[PDB]
Design a binder for these strands. Structure first.
Ligand SMILES: *C[S@@+](CC[C@H](N)C(=O)[O-])C[C@H]1O[C@@H](n2cnc3c(N)ncnc32)[C@H](O)[C@@H]1O
Length: 327
DNA sequence: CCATGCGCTGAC
DNA sequence: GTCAGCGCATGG
């Protein structure tokens, strides 16, 4: 994450829905805001959350009475994406995991917060010939809110990872906000090679296979893109090997293959996958965050999360707009 | 719960 | 024609 000197969100309160590891919480707290409610139903995720923030989140949002939720200024939500991802079956609103958006709407109707901040995958903007996004935009308009949305790539904000996502920002109409803007991209200067741990600590992740087929030579200069060097098996998800002089492929939660969820890399002459701590680093988390003792739950949690740095820039811009009040 | 072989879609 | 994907399916 980045250091913020000008704390634009001092005095404001927020709630953390579909909490996970708390990526939305780290970002907003660094800007000066205070968290007054959290919700998440997974046993293992509630354990890391409590380990790091000192509180246990509430369970199943579909059966929580929206009137019991505390007053707040900003609602945060990185809702489920299996029903919209290009890697799944694309069932959309027909999917039992695809209706969570209407629960958010239910809460927004009652509490009427100043800002709604949401995140989902890139395919969300294209799904069902554009109907899915129009449905979300019209619902927010009907509740008396404006709608701003755009797809941003993590590699343009200083983190070496190809992770394209859609961010949706909404302001209550009586506030009359007319100067909000998404942050501007800058040049990348850090690469996969600069975030790795010492060879001694990662010996156990090395994989030596006999069907390894190199198809490209190692590159001699760094570059802001994914560079594939070789393959194992039939070359499907989890069987592709990349260079550490380039950037990392997007991390997943339920992925398979011998190099599952992280992908494989050529390091000092050997091929291996990433360690949980290196996953924390490519997601923008500080070395002081404590990970789950179970390696299996840790990879799943990081693959479902958000890049901290990108949210910090967006949150600062939300505060700047709220504070501009001339006579 | 955990590990790993798959097979199709979207955007070039 | 080439390449990537906060995923699915089945074995123990
Ligand atoms: C995909 S993920 C959010 C990650 C988070 N932004 C981060 O780690 O920083 C979605 C999370 O939502 C939880 N979830 C799914 N359905 C429910 C219901 N109905 N009630 C509560 N929580 C739910 C998932 O377990 C996941 O962690």
């Amino acid at each position: 994450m980045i250091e913020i000197k000008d704390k634009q969100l001092t005095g404001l309160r927020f709630i953390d829905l579909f909490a996970g590891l708390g990526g939305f919480r780290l970002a907003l707290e660094s800007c000066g805001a205070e968290c007054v409610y959290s919700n998440e139903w997974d046993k293992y995720a509630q354990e890391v959350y409590e380990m790091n923030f000192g509180e246990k989140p509430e369970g199943d949002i579909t059966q929580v009475n929206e009137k019991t939720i505390p007053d707040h200024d900003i609602l945060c939500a990185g809702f489920p994406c299996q029903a919209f991802s290009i890697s799944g079956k694309q069932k959309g609103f027909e999917d039992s995991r695809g209706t969570l958006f209407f629960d958010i709407a239910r809460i927004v109707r009652e509490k009427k917060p100043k800002v709604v901040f949401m995140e989902n995958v890139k395919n969300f903007a294209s799904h069902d010939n554009g109907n899915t996004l129009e449905v979300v935009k019209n619902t927010m308009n009907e509740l008396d809110y404006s709608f701003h949305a755009k797809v941003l790539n993590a590699l343009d904000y200083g983190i070496p990872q190809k992770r394209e996502r859609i961010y949706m920002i909404c302001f209550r109409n009586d506030l009359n906000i007319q100067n909000f803007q998404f942050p501007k991209p800058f040049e990348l200067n850090t690469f996969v090679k600069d975030l790795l741990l010492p060879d001694s600590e990662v010996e156990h992740l090395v994989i030596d296979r006999k069907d390894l087929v190199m198809t490209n030579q190692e590159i001699e200069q760094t570059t802001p893109k994914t560079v594939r060097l070789g393959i194992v098996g039939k070359g499907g998800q989890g069987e592709r090997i990349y260079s550490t002089r380039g950037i990392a492929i997007t991390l997943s939660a339920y992925g398979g293959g011998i190099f599952a969820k992280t992908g494989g890399y050529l390091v000092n002459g050997k091929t291996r996958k990433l360690h949980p701590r290196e996953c924390a680093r490519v997601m923008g988390y500080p070395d002081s965050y404590k990970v789950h003792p179970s390696t299996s739950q840790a990879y799943k949690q990081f693959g479902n999360s958000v890049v901290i740095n990108v949210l910090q820039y967006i949150a600062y811009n939300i505060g700047s707009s709220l504070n501009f009040k001339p006579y």
